[PDB]
Design a protein that fits this description.
This protein has a domain of about 160 residues: Up-down Bundle (A middle domain of Talin 1). The chain is about 80% helix and about 0% strand. Helix 11 packs antiparallel against helix 12. The protein is mainly alpha-helical and about 475 residues long.
């Protein structure tokens, strides 16, 4: 009854509905790439933060219309977070080696069912007698987005099909959905500088042919002939997606709590206990979002492999430090059963392989996230044979200064490789990371190139 209560009511329903995306992410949620998911959570963080400020201030000052605007904006941001979270979880799950992505059909029935549900909610909101101006706009924007998505999928489906009857039906259904929503859009435009009871009644009337067309499309699209095979996600994939899922669930739970409390406060703002409860939920919303973003970044393509490569390089560094400390106290035992020449050849071979991987690695770090993991693993693998050969070669180097110089120079190469790996992990193969990492990447490549040259020179002098 009271203004602002309906908005809180709709928000709670929207948060409960969007939570379903999190229960079993075995199909794509949308068309976003992993980097798109990350961008969306960053953008929604800003939007939700401002909306949360708006909720509190307008409940406190009794500005009920703008309180409803703030609840609506927060709900949209939270659904945004969840869609990005669920999509990220799906992409994580399928990319697992032991996981099998399901065959894509002509359409994804879950996306069709979701769109059907979002259109119903938006249409029912337009069918409300006490619906406001900014509520009509958000409901109108929802309808337009989901009907466009539905029509686009119908078009591609009637192009990818061999079945002539299905071809004609997807085209026909698209026509009906499009013609329906066009008729609704016109009635919504008629509201500008008018907004009368006679006109809101025009809009309500126009929703019925849309709902009917959408519900017909949904039925028809759920036929076994069209549906996708849900993916088979390994127990490991499930484990990797878990942090992302848990975080987004905690976000939704505490945001529900924030809204329930906000609802009472809008009615009676003179209530210190409830301000304390609202603040509690708010801090938990923020913590959950931080954990969600950090969880999602852990699972971007190439991130685990950078981490694994960095661990392997650090293991090589420990070996080199150990050999260096043994050398200075004359306690480095000479490597048995292999010659000085053969050990220098193993070093040169490894150094040449590392050298060839530098620029390819940087280009992946720069532009191609799908390559990065591989290049980082290839680079790191060569450091094990190099370290063993260098420790061996040093152990048999007759001059003490030269023995120490060989270890020092091998260490410098390893440390320059570490700096490149850390920089590549930051850039992550995301073209939009350029303005923050480009000069650091150039520096890291320069330092690596220099360290290769210096060690190669030493190895060339030893060959002479």
């Amino acid at each position: 009854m009271a203004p602002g209560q309906k908005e809180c009511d709709n928000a709670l329903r929207q948060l409960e509905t969007v939570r379903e995306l999190l229960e079993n992410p075995v199909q794509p949620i949308n068309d976003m790439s992993y980097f798109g998911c990350l961008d969306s959570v960053m953008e929604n963080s800003k939007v939700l933060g401002e909306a949360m400020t708006g909720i509190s201030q307008n409940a406190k000052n009794g500005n009920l219309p703008e309180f409803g605007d703030a609840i609506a904006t927060a709900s949209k941001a939270l659904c945004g977070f969840t869609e990005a979270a669920a999509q990220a979880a799906y992409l994580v799950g399928v990319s697992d080696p032991n996981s099998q992505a399901g065959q894509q059909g002509l359409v994804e029935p879950t996306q069709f069912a979701r769109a059907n549900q979002a259109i119903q909610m938006a249409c029912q909101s337009l069918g409300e007698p006490g619906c406001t101006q900014a509520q009509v706009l958000s409901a109108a924007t929802i309808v337009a987005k989901h009907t466009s998505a539905l029509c686009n999928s119908c078009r591609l489906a009637s192009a990818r099909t061999a079945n002539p009857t299905a071809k004609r039906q997807f085209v026909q259904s698209a026509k009906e959905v499009a013609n329906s929503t066009a008729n609704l859009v016109k009635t919504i435009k008629a509201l500008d500088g008018d907004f009368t009871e006679e006109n809101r009644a025009q809009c309500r009337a126009a929703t019925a042919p849309l709902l009917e067309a959408v519900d017909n499309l949904s039925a028809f699209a759920s036929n076994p002939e069209f549906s996708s095979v849900p993916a088979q996600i390994s127990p490991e994939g499930r484990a990797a997606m878990e942090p992302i899922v848990i975080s987004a669930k905690t976000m939704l739970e505490s945001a529900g709590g924030l809204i329930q409390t906000a609802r009472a406060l809008a009615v009676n703002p003179r209530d210190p206990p409830r301000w304390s409860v609202l603040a509690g939920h708010s801090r938990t919303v923020s913590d959950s979002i931080k954990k969600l973003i950090t969880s999602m970044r852990d699972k971007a393509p190439g991130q685990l492999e950078c981490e694994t490569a960095i661990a392997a390089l650090n293991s090589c560094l420990r070996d080199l430090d150990q050999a260096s400390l043994a050398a200075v106290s004359q306690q480095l035992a000479p490597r048995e059963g292999i010659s000085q020449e053969a050990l220098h050849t193993q070093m040169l071979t490894a150094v040449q392989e590392i050298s060839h991987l530098i620029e390819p690695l940087a280009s992946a770090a720069r532009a191609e996230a799908s390559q990065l993991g591989h290049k980082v693993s290839q680079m790191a693998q060569y450091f094990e044979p190099l370290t063993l050969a260098a420790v061996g070669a040093a152990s048999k180097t007759l001059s003490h200064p030269q023995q120490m110089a060989l270890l020092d120079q091998t260490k410098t190469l390893a440390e320059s490789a570490l700096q490149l790996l850390y920089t590549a992990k930051e850039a992550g193969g995301n073209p939009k990371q350029a303005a923050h990492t480009q000069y650091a990447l150039y520096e890291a490549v320069y330092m690596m190139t220099e360290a290769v040259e210096d060690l190669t020179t030493t190895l060339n002098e030893a060959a002479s």
